[PDB]
Amino acid sequence: SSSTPLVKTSVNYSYGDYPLIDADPHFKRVVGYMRPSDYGVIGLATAALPAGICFAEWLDPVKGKFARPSVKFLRVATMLGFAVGFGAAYARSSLRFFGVTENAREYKKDEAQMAARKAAGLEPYGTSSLTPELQEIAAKNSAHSIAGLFIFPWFNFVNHPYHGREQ
Amino acid sequence: TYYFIEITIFLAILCTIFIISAKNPMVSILYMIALFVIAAMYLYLIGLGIFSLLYIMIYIGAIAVLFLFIITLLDINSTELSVKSNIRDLPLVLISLIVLTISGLMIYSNDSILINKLLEAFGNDYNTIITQDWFNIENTTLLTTIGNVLLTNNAFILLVLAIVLLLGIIGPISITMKHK
Amino acid sequence: MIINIVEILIFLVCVLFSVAYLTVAERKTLAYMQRRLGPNFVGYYGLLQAFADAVKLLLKEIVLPKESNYIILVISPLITLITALIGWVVIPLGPGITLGELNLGILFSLAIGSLGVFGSLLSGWSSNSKYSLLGSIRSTAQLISYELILTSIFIIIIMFVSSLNITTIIETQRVVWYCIPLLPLLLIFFIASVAETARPPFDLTESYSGSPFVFFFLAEYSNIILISAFNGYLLLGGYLSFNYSYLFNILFNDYSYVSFLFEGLINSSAYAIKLVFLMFSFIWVRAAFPRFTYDNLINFCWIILLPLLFGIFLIIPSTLYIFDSFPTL
Amino acid sequence: RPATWEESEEGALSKATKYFLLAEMFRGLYVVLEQFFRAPYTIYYPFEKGPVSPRFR
Amino acid sequence: INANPGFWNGPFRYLRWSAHNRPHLFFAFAIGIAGPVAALTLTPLRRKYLYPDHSPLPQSYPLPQRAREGLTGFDD
Amino acid sequence: AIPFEALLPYGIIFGLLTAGGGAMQVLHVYRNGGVRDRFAIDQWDSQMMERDLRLNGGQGRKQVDQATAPEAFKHNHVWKSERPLI
Amino acid sequence: PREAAAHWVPFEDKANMPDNVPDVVEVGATSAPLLSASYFIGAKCKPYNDDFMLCREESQGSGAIDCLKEGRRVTRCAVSVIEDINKSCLDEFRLHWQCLEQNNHQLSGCRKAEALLNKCVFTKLNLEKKIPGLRPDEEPVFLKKDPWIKPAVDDFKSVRAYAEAKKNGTL
Amino acid sequence: MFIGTIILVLSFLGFVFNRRNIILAFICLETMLLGINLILLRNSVLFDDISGSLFAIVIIILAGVESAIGLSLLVSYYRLRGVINSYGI
Amino acid sequence: MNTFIIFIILIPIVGFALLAVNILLAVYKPYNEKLGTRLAFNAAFILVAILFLPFDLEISTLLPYVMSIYLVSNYGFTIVLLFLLILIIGFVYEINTNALKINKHNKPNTDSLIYK
Numbered sequence A: 001s002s003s004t005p006l007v008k009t010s011v012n013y014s015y016g017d018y019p020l021i022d023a024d025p026h027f028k029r030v031v032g033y034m035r036p037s038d039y040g041v042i043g044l045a046t047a048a049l050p051a052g053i054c055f056a057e058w059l060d061p062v063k064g065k066f067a068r069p070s071v072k073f074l075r076v077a078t079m080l081g082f083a084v085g086f087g088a089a090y091a092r093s094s095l096r097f098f099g100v101t102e103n104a105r106e107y108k109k110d111e112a113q114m115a116a117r118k119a120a121g122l123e124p125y126g127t128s129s130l131t132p133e134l135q136e137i138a139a140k141n142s143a144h145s146i147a148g149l150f151i152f153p154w155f156n157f158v159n160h161p162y163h164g165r166e167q
Numbered sequence B: 001t002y003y004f005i006e007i008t009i010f011l012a013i014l015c016t017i018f019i020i021s022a023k024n025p026m027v028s029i030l031y032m033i034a035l036f037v038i039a040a041m042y043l044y045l046i047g048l049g050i051f052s053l054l055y056i057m058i059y060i061g062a063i064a065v066l067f068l069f070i071i072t073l074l075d076i077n078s079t080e081l082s083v084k085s086n087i088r089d090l091p092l093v094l095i096s097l098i099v100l101t102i103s104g105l106m107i108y109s110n111d112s113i114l115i116n117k118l119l120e121a122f123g124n125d126y127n128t129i130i131t132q133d134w135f136n137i138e139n140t141t142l143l144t145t146i147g148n149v150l151l152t153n154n155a156f157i158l159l160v161l162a163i164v165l166l167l168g169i170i171g172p173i174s175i176t177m178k179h180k
Numbered sequence C: 001m002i003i004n005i006v007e008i009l010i011f012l013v014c015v016l017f018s019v020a021y022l023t024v025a026e027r028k029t030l031a032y033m034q035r036r037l038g039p040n041f042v043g044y045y046g047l048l049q050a051f052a053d054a055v056k057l058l059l060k061e062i063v064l065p066k067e068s069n070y071i072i073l074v075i076s077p078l079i080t081l082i083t084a085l086i087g088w089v090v091i092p093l094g095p096g097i098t099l100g101e102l103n104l105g106i107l108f109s110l111a112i113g114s115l116g117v118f119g120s121l122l123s124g125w126s127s128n129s130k131y132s133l134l135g136s137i138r139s140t141a142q143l144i145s146y147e148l149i150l151t152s153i154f155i156i157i158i159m160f161v162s163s164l165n166i167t168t169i170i171e172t173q174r175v176v177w178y179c180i181p182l183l184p185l186l187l188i189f190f191i192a193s194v195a196e197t198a199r200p201p202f203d204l205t206e207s208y209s210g211s212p213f214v215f216f217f218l219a220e221y222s223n224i225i226l227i228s229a230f231n232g233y234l235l236l237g238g239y240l241s242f243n244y245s246y247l248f249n250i251l252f253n254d255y256s257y258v259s260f261l262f263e264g265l266i267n268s269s270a271y272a273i274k275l276v277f278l279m280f281s282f283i284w285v286r287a288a289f290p291r292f293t294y295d296n297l298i299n300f301c302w303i304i305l306l307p308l309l310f311g312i313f314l315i316i317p318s319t320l321y322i323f324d325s326f327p328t329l
Numbered sequence D: 001r002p003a004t005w006e007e008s009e010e011g012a013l014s015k016a017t018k019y020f021l022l023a024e025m026f027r028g029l030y031v032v033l034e035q036f037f038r039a040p041y042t043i044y045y046p047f048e049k050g051p052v053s054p055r056f057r
Numbered sequence E: 001i002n003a004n005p006g007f008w009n010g011p012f013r014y015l016r017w018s019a020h021n022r023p024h025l026f027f028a029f030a031i032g033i034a035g036p037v038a039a040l041t042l043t044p045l046r047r048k049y050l051y052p053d054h055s056p057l058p059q060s061y062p063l064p065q066r067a068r069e070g071l072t073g074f075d076d
Numbered sequence F: 001a002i003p004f005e006a007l008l009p010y011g012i013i014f015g016l017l018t019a020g021g022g023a024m025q026v027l028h029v030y031r032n033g034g035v036r037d038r039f040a041i042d043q044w045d046s047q048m049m050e051r052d053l054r055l056n057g058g059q060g061r062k063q064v065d066q067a068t069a070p071e072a073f074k075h076n077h078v079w080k081s082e083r084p085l086i
Numbered sequence G: 001p002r003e004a005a006a007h008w009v010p011f012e013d014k015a016n017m018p019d020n021v022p023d024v025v026e027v028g029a030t031s032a033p034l035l036s037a038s039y040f041i042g043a044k045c046k047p048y049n050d051d052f053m054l055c056r057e058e059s060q061g062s063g064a065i066d067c068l069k070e071g072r073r074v075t076r077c078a079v080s081v082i083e084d085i086n087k088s089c090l091d092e093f094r095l096h097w098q099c100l101e102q103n104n105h106q107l108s109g110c111r112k113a114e115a116l117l118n119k120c121v122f123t124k125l126n127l128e129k130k131i132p133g134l135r136p137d138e139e140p141v142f143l144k145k146d147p148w149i150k151p152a153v154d155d156f157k158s159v160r161a162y163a164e165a166k167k168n169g170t171l
Numbered sequence H: 001m002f003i004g005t006i007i008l009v010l011s012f013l014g015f016v017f018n019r020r021n022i023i024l025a026f027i028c029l030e031t032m033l034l035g036i037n038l039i040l041l042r043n044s045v046l047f048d049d050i051s052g053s054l055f056a057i058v059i060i061i062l063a064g065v066e067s068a069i070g071l072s073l074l075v076s077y078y079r080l081r082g083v084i085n086s087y088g089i
Numbered sequence I: 001m002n003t004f005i006i007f008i009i010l011i012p013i014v015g016f017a018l019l020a021v022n023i024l025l026a027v028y029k030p031y032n033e034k035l036g037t038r039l040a041f042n043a044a045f046i047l048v049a050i051l052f053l054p055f056d057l058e059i060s061t062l063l064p065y066v067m068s069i070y071l072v073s074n075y076g077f078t079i080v081l082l083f084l085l086i087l088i089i090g091f092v093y094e095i096n097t098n099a100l101k102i103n104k105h106n107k108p109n110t111d112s113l114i115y116k
């Protein structure tokens, strides 16, 4: 009742050298497990868009002689830079769940966390406010949506029962 | 009241011929509105009562209104169906009518054989047997299931469709404004 | 087959009498708001004056101008007459008392109300003069612009019922009406209803003889009572007044034809008193206000009312979401 | 000098409640509603004549 | 005449300006963002305090997963 | 005060719609045979109404309550044969 | 599964069961008596109905012919429940479904007759009306006091019988 | 399939041999889309599924948006030339 | 054979009857004095009815959702939220651009009085 997956699914089907953690991690887990280098990537992209606009003005100015771009452009540059940096950090961190990059730092955290959720006496991936049909369709929508980050942003917010794992 | 579908088929033929040969451009457009009504008649006739009112609401009430609204305040020249103009067209009209008609009838068939492909389109005569099964417990009609599958299984199609509606807003504005 | 044709000519005689007396009623209350008498010249107290006017205008010379399609000009009255009158099926005078009980009644009432634009626009192409066209353009532009927010208010109301049947909505409204939670929507729907007929609060283009006049005349007031019927069923209680179970357990003892007669009297008296207060408010807002420029009208619809309506689109499913209250089919 | 928006005694909530709830429109509505319930002026002409002074011509 | 300060020069001053001088846009956006923000932040509070969620309605006949065990009744 | 003449055509509008609704309700009850109409009919309830017309014998909604069904009930069962849909 | 449109014409069949399958006598209750006793049919005949649908699941596609022997027993057990409820509670079962044929067969509008019917059937036929899937901390709908959804007019026979059951102390 | 096929074919040939004005071309395009709708919705009814109904409700919206786009395109065609020729663009 | 279709066919009978009564009944008797290029228009006139249609297509796209609102609970809700907000952004484009205005071509001519 509300956690039997009722489908057949990959078991530990790793996408690289390294073992998988989730087949689609929840958004909270991706934000929880990202490294300080990932926050450095977010800061890099937040800095690189207004500095890039200042740079591209210094190369070729718009109306002939060089001025700084307006603050109305710098703030939109910084907002879109945070958007690029968050997309980059979410994709970087999701790669560690799939097992295509190095994830021995996070594999320990997940075995600790699922041992804790066994000790707390609750479900291994979360109680959801959905029928299992809707959980299944909702996770068919967000399965492997990190590919195609170039077109559209799409995330996992459903606590559905299957993540390409056993027991 | 057996031949209803045949009657709508014939009346649709006649209405298209009145569309393509009409004095006045908006006499032609009112014949198109009549063809939409014949369509909605066929759709209620086949069993789709929802769609017929969707056709009357969207096609008649928005697209035909936009079309008539265009014809009113714009100037459009028109020649009428002279016989000097258009019987130079008629031999290829006849060849393409028979060929395109038979060819549209062709692809509902699976034979190696050419005219066994054709005459299986006319093998229509057998009356489908409708059985009652009591397996469905609720009033899920057709609009409900369209709302389930536009929203769960094809939610991405609905959001790309939102981008298409956005483009239908932005584009006509972007053309016709002359910014300051 | 005797049964349904006697039922339909009873319904037709009722509604096509009541669209005639609505005219006599507007002249009299417009007069008393202006501190004068209405007509008292033609009936014992002024009644059958709409009959006097129809008797005379069916005696009036029809002029078909040099400029005109003759066929288009006299069957635009009929296509507006027929679709201003076709929408009278689906309104219930009681639970399941319509001329056709179809499970998609709002989709029908919404599809017929979009068919009513043509007899404005099309009849601009009658008598093709350069000012006989762009006035029809302004007319049809306002007409479509306000049936947008009409359709919007309908779909906001169906978020509470999730059924396009109409008497299902009224049976759903037994616990509470829909004006009491959504009273801004009653204000918005009233002014959109006033615009959709192009009433003389929201009139610009005013500011034939005979049959093309009396068909447009009848279509105008049939549209009045038809959009009043729409307001009566989806926003006020349709045929609902109070409980009346205790009064019946005092009066009656078992189901008889007099008990069904009494119940139908109570239900359609509630429906008619909603509709009559609504038509009075139409004439009452006609009496008190000047009119609009086209720019005030388009600014009003597209720039003021519609963003607020987008906010309503966001706010009402969200409160149906916060408390787990989604309506089931 | 005409007052700016910030030097006004009314709150934005108070001012826009009068905006969206049509306050003085309703006031002018209630005026003619009062006039529905009063006595008309009409005299019935061949049965009742209006004023006469002897100076009239 | 009342000029636009912009959202960026002073935020709360621009919010006050829009509430005084463009009340239809301010209150349309107010009602609009009151929806999903309260949809985010209020429903865990309701599931914690007011009432937990309803159990799902059935949609088909509910089949259990057994193997037709023999029942001695209506053997006739 | 209140003009009676102004509100009399409203009175006739009210009376015409009231009498129309009452007469129409009694016409509906006379059609059903003493009971009210069914105002929202499912596909399930459509199939249930045709089954009860099959079971009661001819009548619309007579609503027999019998122990075990009659003899002609096993033989009066209907399938629907629909035309080619050209 | 789809419904017939566009000039369906009905047809029936002058024939018989073959000798292979025994006789089964039918259910002769219509929708208001069937909807009335639906919960008691479901209370007594739960394992029979579930074995029938489990048959239909187990041998897929054969369907009709390989599940006839248990489709026999579900019909016979429901007939047993209906004559059981006739011979004990005929007058208030009749009171219930005569309420139910007005009010669009809504169970929402016949509470005072179904209280009487549930009390009779529970003390004499010893079957209880229950809604499954309902966890605790959730009240069942036909038990609650002052519901939001009351019917238009309460039926006269059932409010008279309900008051007389109050004054007898029956209920 | 007959009604959708013949409205599509006659609509197509009325589009092709249009030499009289431009709005006959628009309305022949829209009636082509109607015929495609007819064929698809019949197939959805015959196969007992919604997926043809899904493609049909999506192509209704796409036909509407194309009418809006293209009629604004005609208006901009008309801006610089206050006439629309009978023979065509 | 229902009471739905007698209405559909009977409302024209009403109309055909009444315009018959007048055409059959009244005087025709016309003459010349009784009987009797193109203008340019602003962009907002054609704009109101062109941009009318993409909002109308959205309003009938909500119509499959509000019938399915229980079945897609918590999930189709958010999909519809995203749909509505994507179209609200095109609407705030439209009202930020001041598209539907017809604006008056003559000012008070604000430019000041300077000399020499």
Ligand SMILES: CCCCCCCCCCCCCCCCCC(=O)OC[C@H](COP(=O)(O)OCCN)OC(=O)CCCCCCCCCCCCCCCCC
Residues within 6 Å of the ligand: C184, C185, C187, C188, C190, C191, C194, C201, C281, C285, C289, C296, C297, C299, C300, C304, C308, D013, D016, D017, D019, D020, D021, D022, E027, E028
């Ligand atoms: C803080 C309050 C709540 C906050 C939540 C936000 C809103 C929720 C409430 C929504 C209800 C909205 C009702 C309609 C809003 C009307 C707003 C309005 O006043 O429109 C202004 C508009 C022009 O705007 P503008 O140029 O800025 O000038 C305004 C002068 N200050 O003016 C115009 O263009 C014309 C105005 C037309 C007004 C209608 C006129 C005729 C209709 C009268 C109907 C009266 C109904 C009474 C019936 C009584 C029945 C018993």
